[PDB]
C-alpha cells in the first residue's frame, strides 16, 4: 500500500478529539457553587492507519490453484477475473457452442495455446491483435 498516504489520515483524525476536549474542559463545574468535578472531563486522542486484509478462502491445500466449484467465461488474451496457476483441465471446460471458435473435439484446450476452427461455425467477429503493431 505504501505508508505516505497513511500518515496524512492519522493527523486529520486527531483534530476532532482536541476540539471537543477544549470546550468541554473549559466549562467550570468546580469553581461554580455546584461541584461535580472538572477531572472527570479527561478525554484522550486517536489516529487512523490501514493495512491489506489477510483471509484464506478456497484453500484445499496452502496454495493449490484455489479450485472454484463454479465457472465463468474468460476472453482470449485476457483474465477478466484473474486465473490461477496450473489447471490444464479446468481451462476450456466445454467450448461454447455459439462462439466463432468451436471444434471437432471438445476440451483440447489447456493454457498451452490452441486455435479452434471457424469451418464448423462462424457467428461472432474475429479480433486479431498482436503487439506486432506496437513494436514496428
Amino acid at each position: 500500500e505504501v505508508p505516505k498516504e497513511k500518515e496524512k489520515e492519522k493527523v486529520s483524525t486527531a483534530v476532532l478529539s482536541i476540539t471537543a476536549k477544549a470546550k468541554k474542559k473549559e466549562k467550570e463545574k468546580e469553581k461554580k457553587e455546584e461541584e461535580k468535578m472538572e477531572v472527570d472531563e479527561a478525554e484522550k486522542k486517536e489516529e487512523k492507519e490501514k493495512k491489506k486484509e489477510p483471509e484464506p478462502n478456497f484453500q484445499l491445500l496452502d496454495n493449490p490453484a484455489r479450485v472454484m466449484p463454479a465457472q465463468l467465461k474468460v476472453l482470449s488474451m485476457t483474465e477478466t477475473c484473474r486465473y490461477q496457476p496450473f489447471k490444464p483441465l479446468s481451462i476450456g471446460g466445454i467450448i461454447i457452442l455459439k462462439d466463432t471458435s468451436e471444434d471437432i473435439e471438445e476440451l483440447v484446450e489447456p493454457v498451452a495455446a490452441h486455435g479452434p476452427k471457424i469451418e464448423e461455425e462462424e457467428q461472432e467477429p474475429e479480433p486479431p491483435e498482436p503487439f506486432e503493431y506496437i513494436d514496428d
Binding site: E105, P116, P130, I134, D136
Partner: protein
C-alpha cells in the same frame, strides 16, 4: 484380456496391457476404442509412472500416435507428449502430414500454437525443415519460430498487468544506492514482465550509475525481462549503457546491456542475433563479453545455427574470467535436446583445466541443459563428475541428473545424489543434492516434503537453503499444504 475386450473398457485395457507389455494389446487387440480425449491421455502418464525403462515407453507412445493418425480427428495433446518425452521429430510430423489430405489449414495452426508453449524451444527449429517436405495445408513458419506467437501473448500480459513502481521509489530515494541497488533491480525486473514500465528506467537513469561491482552488471541486465518481446523500446533502453550512444558508464553496464538484449529477442531471434554474433567475435574479453555471450546463445534457440556453438567454445578456451561463466550456460542451450558429445566434452574437460571460480559455476549448470530427456544415459555422466578430484566438479554432476530425468521420476537418479551428500561432510554437495531431488519427484510431488525434511535437520544451515529450493521447484505450478509449512520456520530463522 478377452474378458476385458468383451466389457469394452479402454481404461481397464491399458492397465492389463501394461502388465503384459504388448503394443497391439494397448490399442485393443482388434481396434474398438476410438475415444480420442480422456482415457487415451491417461495411459501415457501410466507408462511413465510405473515403468523406468525408456525403450518400451517410446514404442507405446509412438504406436498410439499412428493408430489415431488414421482417424479423422487426431488429438493435439497426444503428439505434444511424445514430442517432449522421446525428443523424436516423428510424432508431430506424422499427424501434420495426414492433415494435408484433410486441407484443414485451421487444424495445423492449432497444433503449432500448442507446440510452441509445450515443447522444447531448441527442438522446434529442426522440425520445420522436415514438415515442409511432407507438405502442409509455409504459413506454419511464423508460429513455429515463435515470432508471431510471442507478440500475441504480449497483449495478454500487458493489459492485465497491475503492480506499481512505488515500493522501489521509496527505498532508492531515501539512502544511497549500491547494495539497495540489487534489491530494486531484481524485484523491478521480475514484476513488470511483458508490460510497458520503461517509464521508471528512462527518468531514473541516474539510479544505475551509483552502483558498483556485480550489482552494476545486474542493473542494466534486469531491463530485458521487463521489455520481453517488445522490439520497440528494447534497442533504445540498452543504447545508453552500450557504447552505441553516449554515457556507457562502465564495462559492467555495457555487458549488462548486451545480456538484456539477448533476453528480449530470445526464441524468435531475427536481426539481433547477427549484431550480438559480430560483437562476440570482436570483443572476446571479460565483463562486456559475459552478457554478449549469454544473449547470443538465447537468441540462437528457435532458429538454430552451428556458428554460435564454435564461437562460445573458443571464448571459453581463452581464459577470460567473467565471460567464461556465460559461455558454459550458452553451450548447453544451443546443442540442446538431441545430445552432442562435443558439448558434454568441452564443458566437463574445461572445468578441470581452469582454477577460476566464476567459469566453473557456469559450466556446472551448462552440461545439464544439453542432457534433456536422456534419462538413464545421464547416470554415467553424474557418476564421473562426482568421482572427480575437485569439490567443485562434484556439484556439476548434480546438475546433469536434474535436467535429464524430468518428464520421469525414477529410482535410479535419486540414489546417486544422496550418495554424494552423505559421504562428504562438505556444505556445497549436500545443499546441491537436495535441490535436484525435488525436480525428479515432481511427477508425484507429494513425496518431496517427506524426503526434504530429513535433510534440513542437519548441522549445516547450508543444506537448509537447498531444502527450501527443492520444495519450491517441485510445487512451482501447483503445490501442497505440507510444502508451505516446511518452508515457514526457515523464514523466521535469523541465519540470513
Amino acid at each position: 484380456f478377452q474378458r476385458c475386450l468383451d466389457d469394452h473398457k479402454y481404461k481397464q485395457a491399458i492397465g492389463i496391457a501394461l502388465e503384459t507389455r504388448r503394443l497391439d494389446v494397448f490399442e485393443k487387440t482388434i481396434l474398438e476404442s476410438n475415444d480420442v480425449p480422456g482415457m487415451l491421455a491417461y495411459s501415457l502418464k501410466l507408462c511413465m509412472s510405473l515403468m523406468q525403462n525408456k525403450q518400451f515407453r517410446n514404442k507405446v507412445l509412438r504406436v498410439l500416435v499412428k493408430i489415431y493418425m488414421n482417424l479423422e480427428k487426431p488429438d493435439f495433446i497426444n503428439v505434444c507428449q511424445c514430442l517432449i518425452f522421446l525428443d523424436d521429430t516423428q510424432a508431430v510430423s506424422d499427424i501434420l502430414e495426414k492433415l494435408v489430405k484433410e486441407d484443414n489449414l485451421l487444424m495445423a495452426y492449432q497444433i503449432c500454437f500448442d507446440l510452441y508453449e509445450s515443447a522444447s524451444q531448441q527442438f522446434l527449429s529442426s522440425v520445420i525443415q522436415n514438415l515442409r517436405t511432407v507438405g502442409t495445408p509455409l504459413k506454419m513458419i511464423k508460429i513455429l519460430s515463435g515470432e508471431m506467437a510471442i507478440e500475441l501473448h504480449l497483449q495478454f500480459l500487458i493489459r492485465n498487468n497491475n503492480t506499481d513502481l512505488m515500493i522501489l521509489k521509496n527505498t532508492k530515494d531515501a539512502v544511497r544506492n549500491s547494495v539497495c541497488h540489487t534489491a530494486t533491480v531484481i524485484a523491478n525486473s521480475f514484476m513488470h514482465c511483458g508490460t510497458t514500465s520503461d517509464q521508471f528506467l528512462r527518468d531514473n537513469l541516474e539510479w544505475l550509475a551509483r552502483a558498483t561491482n556485480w550489482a552494476k552488471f545486474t542493473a542494466t541486465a534486469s531491463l530485458g525481462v521487463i521489455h520481453k518481446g517488445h522490439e520497440k523500446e528494447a534497442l533504445q533502453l540498452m543504447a545508453t549503457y552500450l557504447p552505441k550512444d553516449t554515457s556507457p558508464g562502465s564495462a559492467y553496464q555495457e555487458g549488462g546491456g548486451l545480456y538484456a538484449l539477448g533476453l528480449i529477442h530470445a526464441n524468435h531471434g531475427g536481426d539481433i542475433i547477427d549484431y550480438l554474433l559480430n560483437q562476440l567475435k570482436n570483443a572476446s574479453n571479460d565483463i562486456v563479453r559475459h552478457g554478449g555471450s549469454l544473449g547470443l546463445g538465447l537468441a540462437a534457440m528457435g532458429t538454430a545455427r552451428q556458428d554460435v556453438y564454435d564461437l562460445l567454445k573458443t571464448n571459453l578456451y581463452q581464459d577470460d574470467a567473467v565471460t567464461g561463466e556465460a559461455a558454459g550456460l550458452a553451450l548447453g542451450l544451443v546443442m540442446l535436446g538431441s545430445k552432442n558429445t562435443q558439448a558434454i566434452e568441452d564443458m566437463v574437460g574445461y572445468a578441470q583445466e581452469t582454477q577460476h571460480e566464476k567459469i566453473l559455476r557456469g559450466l556446472a549448470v551448462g552440461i545439464a541443459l544439453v542432457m534433456y530427456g536422456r534419462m538413464e544415459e545421464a547416470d554415467a555422466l553424474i557418476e564421473s563428475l562426482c568421482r572427480d578430484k575437485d569439490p567443485i566438479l562434484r556439484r556439476s554432476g548434480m546438475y546433469t541428473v536434474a535436467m535429464a530425468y524430468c518428464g520421469s521420476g525414477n529410482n535410479k537418479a535419486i540414489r546417486r545424489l544422496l550418495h554424494v551428500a552423505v559421504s562428504d561432510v562438505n556444505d556445497d554437495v549436500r545443499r546441491a543434492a537436495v535441490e535436484s531431488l525435488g525436480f525428479i519427484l515432481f511427477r508425484t510431488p507429494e513425496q518431496c516434503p517427506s524426503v526434504v525434511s530429513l535433510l534440513s535437520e542437519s548441522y549445516n544451515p547450508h543444506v537448509r537453503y537447498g531444502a527450501a529450493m527443492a520444495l519450491g521447484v517441485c510445487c512451482a505450478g501447483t503445490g501442497n499444504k505440507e510444502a508451505i509449512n516446511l518452508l515457514e520456520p526457515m523464514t523466521n530463522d535469523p541465519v540470513n
